Amino acid sequence: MLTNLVAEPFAKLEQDFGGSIGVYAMDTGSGATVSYRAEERFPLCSSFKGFLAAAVLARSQQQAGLLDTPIRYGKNALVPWSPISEKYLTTGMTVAELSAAAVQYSDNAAANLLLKELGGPAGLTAFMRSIGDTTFRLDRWELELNSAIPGDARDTSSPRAVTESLQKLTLGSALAAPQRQQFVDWLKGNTTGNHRIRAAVPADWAVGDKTGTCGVYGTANDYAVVWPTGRAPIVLAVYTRAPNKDDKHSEAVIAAAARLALEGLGV
Ligand SMILES: Nc1c(-c2nnn[nH]2)cnn1-c1ccc(Cl)cc1Cl
Ligand SMILES: Nc1c(-c2nnn[nH]2)cnn1-c1ccc(Cl)cc1Cl
Ligand SMILES: Nc1c(-c2nnn[nH]2)cnn1-c1ccc(Cl)cc1Cl
Ligand SMILES: Nc1c(-c2nnn[nH]2)cnn1-c1ccc(Cl)cc1Cl
């Protein structure tokens, strides 16, 4: 199995990190998959925002005009790290702009505003159930969902479920064609992941990704769809945690895990 090829280097990497690393990667060309702690739960942190944007896009298939709807919000909506929605407080933003801000800058006010319109964490969880994801659960809002408490299943998923759902939404049939491409375009425009999966791929590959960084408990992550030039894409997810609250996350560890995953698939 391809999992067997990389089991020992993954174990070395997470011992060096001082925590747990979960990876799932699938080659959509061959069907090969690489697994390491891929069914364990890890905190989503801000990475839930990608699926949040997909849920909004799904809703736009039934509700015509949803994306262009202007949304006004008060200053009490501004949560720490709302760098985009901060700048449009006095003006408002459209639903599509909030979605792009949530994905591409991890804007917290934008994410909470969209979560509200979707019916809160249970509403996003329901969307994930509707595409066949039985693992994902969102329970809380920004920023409480980042507590990343050891053993706590709230606001978690697994690397395998994240990868399978990402595949359905970006490459499969879970979204209609125009919405699927919009989701991919938002992921391609992400600004926060240059040191994670993007650092593991060749310079000529196209990448769409979403990051998460709880910070506490050494907890951070990244998931991505990547396209080798002229080849079928790879979908992968890399999640980390660690036992102590003051343990530091590591972007280099995430990039290194992505490299091992790609090497295991034969790329
Ligand atoms: N804050 C600013 C300025 C700016 N220019 N003059 N004063 N401020 C320009 N770019 N940004 C910015 C930086 C980081 C992120 Cl995440 C989002 C934004 Cl909009
Ligand atoms: N862990 C949290 C919380 C939080 N509030 N309640 N429970 N957790 C809020 N911010 N952060 C945080 C800390 C460090 C880094 Cl690097 C990133 C993040 Cl988002
Ligand atoms: N660190 C992050 C992320 C993030 N998303 N993807 N990776 N990290 C999103 N929000 N925050 C954040 C939260 C609280 C404070 Cl006070 C400062 C920050 Cl910057
Ligand atoms: N590699 C790409 C891209 C792409 N766009 N931007 N960068 N790469 C678009 N389509 N494909 C592709 C090529 C061959 C096969 Cl078999 C399957 C696919 Cl999906």
Tell me the chain's radius of gyration from C-alpha atoms. 17
Tokens coding 65: 């005009």
Helix (H, G, I), strand (E, B) or coil at 136: coil
> Token match 């079928």: residue?
232
User: Is the peptide bond preceding residue 143 cis, with omega within 30 degrees of 0?
Assistant: yes
Structure tokens at 35: 């697994």
Spacing, Cα 3 to ligand 3 middle (Å) = 32
CB 105 within 8 A of CB 191: yes
Give the span between the Cα atoms of 221 and 45, in whole angstroms: 8
46 C-alpha to ligand 3 centroid (Å):
7
- Provide the number of structural domains found in the chain: 1
Q: Burial, 64: exposed, middle or buried (Cβ in 10 Å; 0-12, 13-18, 19+)? A: exposed
Q: How many CA atoms lie within 13 A of 178 on its CB side?
A: 6
Catalytic residue among 35, 46, 85, 158: 46
Using what technique was this structure determined? X-ray
Please check if 186 is assigned to a binding site.
no
Pairing of strands 206-213, 42-43: unpaired
Strands (E), 42-169: 42-43, 70-71, 93-94, 156-157
Q: Which amino acid is at 253?
A: V
Distance from residue 40's CA to the centre of ligand 4 (Å)? 31
Determine the Cα–Cα distance for residues 71 and 114; give it in Å rounded to an integer.
10
Report the alpha-carbon distance of residue 107 to residue 165 in Å, rounded.
22
- 226: β partners: 207, 234
Print the SS3 string covering 137-166.
ECCCCCCHHHCCCCCCCCCEECHHHHHHHH
What's the longest Cα–Cα distance across the chain? 56
CA dist., res. 210 & res. 189, Å (int): 10
Q: State whether the beta carbon of 88 lies less than 6 angstroms from ligand 1.
A: no
List the residue whose alpha carbon is closest to atom 9 of ligand 2: 143
- Cα–Cα distance measured from residue 186 to residue 50, given in angstroms and rounded to the nearest whole number: 9
Consult the annotation and say whether 125 binds a ligand: no
141's tokens: 């809002």
CA distance 260 to 178: 33
Q: Quote the domain boundaries for residue 118.
A: 1-267
Task: Look up 144 and say whether it is catalytic.
Answer: yes
Map residue 223 onto helix, strand or coil.
strand
Q: What's the CATH code of the domain at 203?
A: 3.40.710.10
Helix (H, G, I), strand (E, B) or coil at 241: strand
- What CA–CA distances, in Å, run from 146 to 37, 137, 142, 205, 219? 21, 13, 7, 31, 9
Please give the Cα distance from 193 to 217 (Å, whole number): 20
Distance CA 256, CA 13 (A): 8
Give me 7's structure tokens. 């089991």
- Name the token pair of 153: 């299943």
Cα separation, 267 vs 248, whole angstroms? 30
Alpha-carbon span 3 to 264, nearest angstrom: 7
Q: CA 228 to CA 218: how far, in whole Å?
A: 30
Q: Is 210 helix (H, G, I), strand (E, B) or coil?
A: strand
